[PDB]
């Protein structure tokens, strides 16, 4: 074959080229010494690995039999079987060396599936973004009768934007008297901003807010203000296509928006060999480089200091890069009998070493000298503990200094949510978040319960009782542990990537519930979400909530069971075309084209997100129903039939319809409800890499 041997291993070629030529060079790491550790470090973690998955498979199979054959009944078995383990002692966090973007600033984090580089750029040169283009270009500012969008700019529209941007900067940079409305002109005099009015001139009610300009002090170009840790720079120019039409010249107000970005090689991209995998690791070490280009990275923005002196602000969104969990295998590597390795520890050694060219200046990522890693899937505290180990052996082969990898917790497992505490404790030297990643977490409620009877709709689960206390809880832990001021506390993801409006009226939960940041699907998002945290103290929101303890286990354990005659048939019907219409839509892309992320509008014609977790969620709902009665193999295929043909025509693609059964692609979605039982904790990536790969396979012969 097309491998090469190192040790007990077998690498593709494509990974081997890639790692020698393109991730060692620059490293000062021998590439000898760093394949000998990969197969050191695979040898000698993989039964430990394997073991946890045994006991995920264990756990499940009493929980499964508990509910074949009580609050208080239910809770002391789950501690029998090890399950829901004794509360560790109190105790705070010494992760150190982090940067201020994650120990700091409250804001939103961006993510992005890695495989795409242009995506990946836009969303690493997302840390501003123009607040004009994501009101006039939104749902934020209604298409009223005469503000609507045409194919050129429409006066009325953009006056809407300015009015409500003027707005935004009262209500998070007060003056001193009057309002942005009336502003003038801008002018920095004895290091003090000056907003000229009508009648007079005022200064900031807090001349702190004041943090640098740009051009001339006595006609700036831009004017850089702070809020909460976050900058808003108001942009001058009188002859600007808007400008012209301002009070004061403004020609628009940029956001700090996405502080953080999450590049992702897990949930939002099909990955399933080593040619996959490089392409990916490729624009991972592109990004950490500075030199990747499809459009390329922003150079940090320059500004001088309301007292003079010249500084920078990072251009660019503090990267983390999601690594995918404990559970797949990938065949990148194979061992003498062919046996993959797990994708999880390849992850740790693999991005590990590419970001340590983003620890180097750019022929810079992390000024502290940390390496930002989100660890999935994890179920409880000895995964947890065997993530750390997994670090702390790719530091020792990559030559770091222990703790140089630091991990951001996926809080969407139902096991680590009733363990949280321990979790955080047994990574209380490298955690630098907690989130609770809300659509794996009920996927993972849905499996765990599988068997205790049919559960509520889909949509009814983000308000169950059992998130409500999950979200709640996960806070509690994180400001307990001193999170506050030293690591995030983040929450989840807005799919519905055009209800702007909405988003911008409800997200604002979040900073609300003490989060220092929340997920965002787009720069645009991400800009808009960056409103709530001017609007929102999350450091005062934190230190009130700080000793709260919200959330019972009792709650946290309340399974999502639906009541008695719960629904009307009119109402299971449009669950299962809806649940079918995300599973097809988001499933025919991934095995037919490799996008692990698309836009699929659901039944109410809703642009909605679909990755991994949101079909992990369907598919188990739906197996779910079929499992306990509420719906027959009839109504599943009936639906997937129905919609099939709807999601043909939203879209290189490969009908699925008239014949479905010749359609590998609609083969998975069947696949993924039918066997979404059998599958380890719902998980949906065993369907879909094998789907993914039998395509490619077809396709090749
Ligand atoms: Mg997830």
Same mark, same amino acid.
């Given at each position: 074959?097309?491998?090469?041997?190192?040790?007990?291993?077998?690498?593709?070629?494509?990974?081997?080229?890639?790692?020698?030529?393109?991730?060692?060079?620059?490293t000062?790491?021998?590439?000898?010494?760093?394949? +000998? $550790?990969?197969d050191? !470090?695979?040898?000698?973690?993989?039964? %430990?690995?394997?073991?946890?998955?045994?006991?995920? *498979?264990?756990?499940?199979?009493?929980?499964?039999?508990?509910?074949?054959?009580?609050? /208080?009944?239910?809770?002391?078995?789950?501690?029998?079987?090890?399950?829901?383990?004794?509360?560790?002692?109190?105790?705070?966090?010494?992760?150190? $060396?982090?940067?201020?973007?994650?120990?700091?600033?409250?804001?939103?984090?961006?993510?992005?599936?890695?495989? @795409?580089?242009?995506?990946?750029?836009?969303?690493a040169?997302?840390?501003?973004?123009?607040?004009?283009?994501?009101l006039?270009?939104?749902?934020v500012?209604?298409?009223?009768?005469?503000?609507?969008?045409?194919?050129?700019?429409?006066?009325?529209?953009?006056?809407?934007?300015?009015?409500?941007?003027r707005?935004?900067?009262?209500?998070?940079?007060?003056?001193?008297?009057?309002?942005?409305?009336?502003?003038?002109?801008?002018?920095?005099?004895?290091?003090?901003?000056?907003?000229?009015?009508?009648?007079?001139?005022?200064?900031?009610? @807090?001349?702190?807010?004041?943090?640098?300009?740009?051009?001339?002090? &006595?006609?700036?170009?831009?004017?850089?203000?702070? @809020?909460?840790?976050?900058?808003?720079?108001?942009?001058i120019?009188?002859?600007?296509?808007?400008?012209?039409? /301002?009070?004061?010249?403004?020609?628009?107000?940029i956001?700090?928006?996405?502080?953080?970005?999450?590049? *992702?090689?897990?949930?939002?991209?099909?990955?399933?060999?080593?040619?996959?995998?490089?392409?990916?690791?490729? @624009?991972?070490?592109?990004?950490?480089?500075?030199?990747? +280009?499809?459009?390329?990275?922003?150079? *940090?923005?320059?500004?001088?200091?309301?007292?003079? $002196?010249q500084?920078?602000?990072?251009?660019?969104?503090?990267?983390?890069?999601?690594?995918?969990?404990?559970?797949?295998?990938?065949?990148?590597?194979?061992?003498?009998?062919?046996?993959?390795?797990?994708?999880?520890?390849?992850?740790?050694?693999?991005?590990?070493?590419?970001?340590?060219?983003?620890?180097?200046?750019?022929?810079?990522?992390?000024?502290?000298? #940390?390496?930002?890693? !989100?660890?999935?899937?994890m179920?409880?505290?000895? &995964?947890?503990?065997?993530?750390? &180990?997994?670090?702390?052996?790719?530091? *020792? !082969?990559?030559?770091?200094?222990?703790?140089?990898?630091?991990?951001?917790?996926?809080?969407?497992?139902?096991?680590?949510?009733?363990?949280?505490?321990?979790?955080?404790?047994?990574?209380? /030297?490298?955690?630098?978040?907690?989130?609770?990643?809300?659509?794996?977490?009920?996927?993972?409620?849905?499996?765990?319960?599988?068997e205790?009877?049919?559960?509520?709709?889909?949509?009814?689960?983000? =308000? %169950?009782?059992?998130?409500?206390?999950?979200?709640?809880?996960?806070?509690?832990?994180?400001?307990?542990?001193?999170?506050?001021?030293r690591?995030?506390?983040?929450?989840?993801?807005?799919?519905?990537?055009?209800?702007?409006?909405?988003?911008?009226?409800?997200?604002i939960?979040?900073?609300?519930?003490?989060?220092?940041?929340?997920?965002?699907?787009?720069?645009?998002?991400?800009?808009?979400?960056?409103?709530?945290?001017?609007?929102?103290?999350?450091?005062?929101?934190?230190?009130?909530?700080?000793?709260?303890?919200?959330?019972?286990?009792? %709650?946290?354990?309340?399974?999502?069971? +639906?009541?008695?005659?719960?629904?009307?048939?009119?109402?299971?019907?449009?669950?299962?075309?809806?649940?079918?219409?995300?599973?097809?839509?988001?499933?025919?892309?991934?095995?037919? %084209?490799?996008?692990?992320? #698309?836009?699929?509008?659901?039944?109410?014609?809703?642009?909605?997100?679909?990755?991994?977790?949101?079909?992990?969620?369907? #598919?188990?709902?739906?197996?779910?129903?079929?499992?306990? $009665?509420?719906?027959? #193999?009839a109504?599943v295929?009936? =639906?997937?039939e129905?919609?099939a043909?709807?999601? /043909?025509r939203?879209?290189?693609?490969?009908?699925?319809?008239?014949?479905?059964?010749?359609?590998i692609?609609?083969?998975?979605?069947?696949?993924?409800?039918?066997?979404?039982?059998?599958?380890?904790?719902?998980?949906? &990536?065993?369907?879909?890499?094998?789907?993914?790969?039998?395509?490619?396979?077809?396709?090749?012969?």
């Amino acid at each position: 074959t097309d491998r090469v041997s190192v040790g007990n291993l077998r690498i593709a070629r494509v990974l081997y080229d890639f790692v020698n030529n393109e991730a060692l060079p620059g490293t000062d790491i021998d590439p000898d010494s760093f394949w +000998a $550790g990969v197969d050191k !470090v695979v040898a000698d973690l993989t039964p %430990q690995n394997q073991a946890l998955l045994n006991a995920r *498979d264990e756990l499940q199979a009493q929980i499964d039999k508990w509910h074949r054959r009580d609050m /208080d009944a239910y809770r002391q078995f789950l501690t029998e079987i090890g399950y829901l383990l004794p509360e560790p002692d109190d105790f705070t966090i010494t992760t150190s $060396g982090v940067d201020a973007e994650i120990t700091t600033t409250a804001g939103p984090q961006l993510v992005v599936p890695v495989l @795409n580089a242009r995506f990946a750029l836009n969303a690493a040169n997302a840390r501003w973004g123009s607040l004009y283009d994501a009101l006039y270009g939104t749902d934020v500012i209604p298409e009223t009768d005469g503000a609507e969008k045409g194919p050129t700019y429409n006066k009325v529209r953009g006056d809407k934007v300015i009015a409500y941007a003027r707005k935004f900067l009262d209500d998070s940079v007060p003056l001193s008297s009057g309002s942005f409305g009336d502003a003038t002109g801008f002018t920095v005099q004895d290091g003090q901003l000056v907003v000229a009015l009508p009648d007079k001139s005022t200064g900031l009610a @807090n001349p702190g807010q004041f943090a640098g300009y740009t051009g001339a002090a &006595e006609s700036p170009t831009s004017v850089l203000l702070i @809020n909460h840790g976050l900058h808003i720079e108001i942009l001058i120019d009188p002859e600007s296509q808007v400008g012209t039409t /301002d009070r004061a010249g403004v020609k628009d107000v940029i956001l700090e928006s996405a502080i953080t970005t999450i590049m *992702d090689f897990e949930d939002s991209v099909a990955a399933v060999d080593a040619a996959d995998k490089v392409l990916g690791y490729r @624009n991972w070490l592109g990004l950490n480089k500075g030199d990747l +280009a499809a459009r390329v990275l922003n150079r *940090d923005r320059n500004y001088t200091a309301p007292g003079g $002196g010249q500084f920078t602000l990072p251009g660019r969104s503090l990267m983390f890069v999601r690594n995918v969990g404990h559970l797949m295998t990938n065949d990148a590597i194979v061992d003498t009998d062919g046996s993959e390795v797990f994708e999880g520890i390849m992850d740790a050694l693999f991005t590990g070493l590419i970001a340590i060219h983003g620890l180097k200046a750019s022929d810079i990522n992390s000024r502290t000298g #940390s390496i930002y890693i !989100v660890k999935p899937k994890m179920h409880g505290p000895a &995964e947890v503990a065997f993530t750390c &180990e997994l670090f702390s052996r790719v530091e *020792d !082969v990559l030559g770091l200094p222990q703790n140089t990898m630091k991990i951001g917790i996926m809080d969407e497992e139902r096991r680590t949510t009733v363990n949280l505490k321990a979790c955080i404790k047994a990574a209380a /030297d490298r955690v630098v978040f907690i989130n609770t990643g809300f659509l794996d977490r009920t996927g993972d409620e849905i499996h765990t319960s599988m068997e205790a009877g049919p559960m509520v709709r889909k949509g009814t689960m983000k =308000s %169950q009782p059992w998130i409500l206390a999950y979200e709640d809880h996960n806070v509690d832990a994180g400001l307990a542990a001193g999170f506050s001021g030293r690591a995030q506390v983040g929450k989840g993801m807005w799919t519905m990537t055009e209800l702007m409006a909405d988003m911008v009226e409800t997200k604002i939960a979040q900073p609300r519930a003490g989060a220092s940041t929340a997920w965002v699907p787009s720069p645009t998002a991400a800009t808009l979400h960056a409103l709530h945290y001017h609007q929102v103290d999350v450091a005062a929101v934190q230190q009130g909530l700080a000793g709260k303890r919200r959330a019972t286990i009792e %709650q946290l354990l309340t399974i999502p069971l +639906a009541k008695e005659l719960a629904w009307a048939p009119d109402e299971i019907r449009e669950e299962v075309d809806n649940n079918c219409q995300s599973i097809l839509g988001y499933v025919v892309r991934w095995v037919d %084209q490799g996008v692990g992320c #698309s836009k699929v509008p659901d039944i109410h014609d809703v642009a909605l997100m679909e990755d991994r977790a949101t079909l992990r969620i369907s #598919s188990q709902l739906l197996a779910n129903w079929l499992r306990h $009665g509420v719906i027959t #193999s009839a109504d599943v295929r009936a =639906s997937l039939e129905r919609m099939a043909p709807l999601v /043909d025509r939203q879209n290189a693609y490969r009908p699925m319809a008239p014949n479905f059964d010749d359609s590998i692609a609609f083969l998975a979605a069947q696949e993924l409800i039918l066997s979404g039982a059998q599958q380890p904790n719902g998980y949906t &990536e065993p369907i879909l890499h094998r789907r993914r790969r039998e395509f490619k396979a077809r396709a090749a012969e």
